[PDB]
């Protein structure tokens, strides 16, 4: 599924993300835009390592989930394969956990590159939320 910005924004808002760990809704939606272009099937292989990044939040299989050929820490206790599904509840539960690490949202490189430096005050202004 490719979400639209505002549709993603509604889903994340409904699931307690707005302000989650000090990160505003706009920040979370911007991270998804730049990580995966809002696509639940996004998949980015080998990479820097061996590992891969899965789903709308491009969660890596060395740290966050378990994959086929690439063994894992599995901090989200889940098979990477679930993050390629259309439903994003698992992905959200895992992103909630990722951001709890010391690097915060800087775990997501595309957020650091495309969001962190930006004025996002108007990013969700077209949205009916």
From Swiss-Prot:
Any single GO BP term: defense response to bacterium
Pfam families linked: Lys
Source taxonomy: Eukaryota, Metazoa, Chordata, Craniata, Vertebrata
Disulfide-bond pairs as recorded: 6-127, 30-115, 65-80, 76-94
Cofactor(s), by name: Ca(2+)
UniProt-annotated catalytic positions: 35, 53
Subunit structure: Monomer.
One Gene Ontology MF term: metal ion binding
Domain C-type lysozyme: 1-129
The enzyme's E.C. designation: 3.2.1.17
Organism: Canis lupus familiaris (Dog)
Role played: Lysozymes have primarily a bacteriolytic function; those in tissues and body fluids are associated with the monocyte-macrophage system and enhance the activity of immunoagents.
Other comment: Lysozyme C is capable of both hydrolysis and transglycosylation; it also shows a slight esterase activity. It acts rapidly on both peptide-substituted and unsubstituted peptidoglycan, and slowly on chitin oligosaccharides.
Cofactor note: Binds 1 Ca(2+) ion per subunit.
Recorded catalytic activity of this chain's protein: Hydrolysis of (1->4)-beta-linkages between N-acetylmuramic acid and N-acetyl-D-glucosamine residues in a peptidoglycan and between N-acetyl-D-glucosamine residues in chitodextrins
Protein name (record): Lysozyme C, milk isozyme
Family: Belongs to the glycosyl hydrolase 22 family.
Keywords: Antimicrobial, Bacteriolytic enzyme, Calcium, Disulfide bond, Glycosidase, Hydrolase, Metal-binding, Milk protein
Annotated PANTHER family: LYSOZYME C, LYSOZYME C, MILK ISOZYME
PROSITE patterns: GLYCOSYL_HYDROL_F22_1, GLYCOSYL_HYDROL_F22_2
Residues at which Ca(2+) binds: 82, 85, 87, 90-91
């Amino acid at each position: 599924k490719i979400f639209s910005k505002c549709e993603l924004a509604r889903k994340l808002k409904s699931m307690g993300m707005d302000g989650f760990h000090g990160y505003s809704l706009a920040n979370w939606v911007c991270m998804a835009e730049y990580e995966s272009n809002f696509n639940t099937q996004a998949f980015n292989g080998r990479n820097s390592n061996g590992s891969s990044d899965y789903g709308i939040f491009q969660l890596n299989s060395k740290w966050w989930c378990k994959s086929n050929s690439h063994s894992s820490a599995n901090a989200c206790n889940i098979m990477c394969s679930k993050f390629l599904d259309d439903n994003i509840d698992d992905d959200i539960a895992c992103a909630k956990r990722v951001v709890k690490d010391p690097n915060g949202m800087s775990a997501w490189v595309a957020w650091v590159k495309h969001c962190k430096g930006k004025d996002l005050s108007k990013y969700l202004a077209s949205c009916n939320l």
